[PDB]
């Protein structure tokens, strides 16, 4: 689980939305498991916005925040899951180290703030939603 609070938007992975999220969505991309939903209080992360390949994320399963190397966000083939079929997701970066469905939410962090949250994992390989492209959060 997890989210991201930047202004008055919440950044979460799509199939861990919940029923106010939807009711105050935003924007939702299905292809890179990423919804946004309008928050009441104005919240305090800062959005990376850079081409940064290195950062730190949070692993739930490990209880601890892994320094990564990251791909660029791409067009990545994500094996079937619980809440998605055998499908491309888009946006998505790739690093070596751990990752299990509960670790979806975790966040990658840069220098310059936010890069992503974890959506994907398995075979040793924690995949993350790229946020950086979405520029439209830090304002109104
Ligand atoms: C955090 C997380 C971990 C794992 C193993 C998976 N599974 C897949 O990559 C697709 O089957 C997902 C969706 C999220
Ligand atoms: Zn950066």
Not at 22 to 46: K, P
Request: aromatic share 10%.
């Amino acid at each position: 689980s997890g989210a991201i609070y930047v202004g008055n938007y919440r950044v979460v992975n799509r199939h861990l939305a919940t029923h106010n999220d939807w009711a105050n969505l935003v924007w939702e991309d299905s292809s890179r498991d990423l919804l946004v939903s309008s928050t009441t209080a104005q919240g305090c992360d800062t959005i990376a916005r850079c081409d940064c390949q290195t950062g730190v994320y949070y692993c739930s399963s490990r209880r601890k925040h892994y320094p990564v190397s990251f791909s660029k966000p791409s067009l990545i083939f994500v094996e079937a899951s619980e809440y998605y079929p055998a499908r491309y997701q888009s946006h998505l970066m790739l690093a070596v180290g751990h990752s299990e469905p509960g670790d979806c939410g975790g966040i990658l962090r840069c220098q310059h703030g936010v890069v992503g949250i974890v959506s994907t994992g398995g075979n040793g390989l924690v995949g993350f939603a790229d946020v950086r492209d979405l520029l439209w959060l830090d304002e109104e």
